[PDB]
Amino acid sequence: DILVVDDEVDIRDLVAGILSDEGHETRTAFDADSALAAINDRAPRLVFLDIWLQGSRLDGLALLDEIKKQHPELPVVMISGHGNIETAVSAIRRGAYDFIEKPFKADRLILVAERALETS
């Protein structure tokens, strides 16, 4: 499976839509509790995780740490905004595979998803 964790419904729908159109089965979550429950239900192949997760008990990086602690082999790709490159590089230092910055194109998203799925 491939889990998309983002409180921003528009970006989450766009990401899930692009990946589903490419032939991947997608699952969505909107915070730390919904994401952790979805992974414990069935471990996904890949996770796309928003760096903020506004309204969540745990923000994107605090959730990344939790996912990495519980599932070290599970690749996590961050999704960030303009001016967040230092937070995205901090996420890579903490185990994130990569990051994608908004506004992003579909081919870029599929490429990073592809690249993350090969390292196994």
Side-chain angles (χ1 to χ4, degrees):
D1 186 74
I2 163 167
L3 179 71
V4 185
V5 193
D6 197 343
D7 56 290
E8 211 171 15
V9 283
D10 35 300
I11 299 297
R12 202 182 65 225
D13 286 352
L14 178 265
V15 169
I18 287 164
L19 294 166
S20 224
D21 285 359
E22 217 58 25
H24 299 98
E25 18 67 56
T26 55
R27 261 194 295 151
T28 59
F30 53 90
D31 72 339
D33 295 343
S34 55
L36 292 171
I39 300 160
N40 291 324
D41 181 54
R42 58 145 292 105
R45 259 148 200 204
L46 174 62
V47 182
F48 272 95
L49 176 54
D50 180 75
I51 249 177
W52 194 358
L53 289 183
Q54 177 173 29
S56 184
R57 188 181 46 84
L58 256 41
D59 75 2
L61 263 79
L63 179 58
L64 160 74
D65 287 334
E66 196 52 43
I67 295 167
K68 284 277 114 176
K69 187 194 183 78
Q70 291 183 30
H71 306 91
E73 294 191 307
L74 174 52
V76 179
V77 174
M78 306 308 289
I79 123 102
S80 59
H82 191 269
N84 293 325
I85 297 161
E86 185 47 34
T87 301
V89 334
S90 293
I92 317 297
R93 288 199 296 260
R94 288 161 102 98
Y97 174 75
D98 207 340
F99 76 95
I100 47 163
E101 193 173 298
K102 292 170 289 174
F104 56 88
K105 322 298 116 185
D107 55 314
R108 237 217 189 272
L109 199 198
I110 300 153
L111 174 67
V112 175
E114 266 278 1
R115 284 255 214 90
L117 288 163
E118 355 263 41
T119 312
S120 61

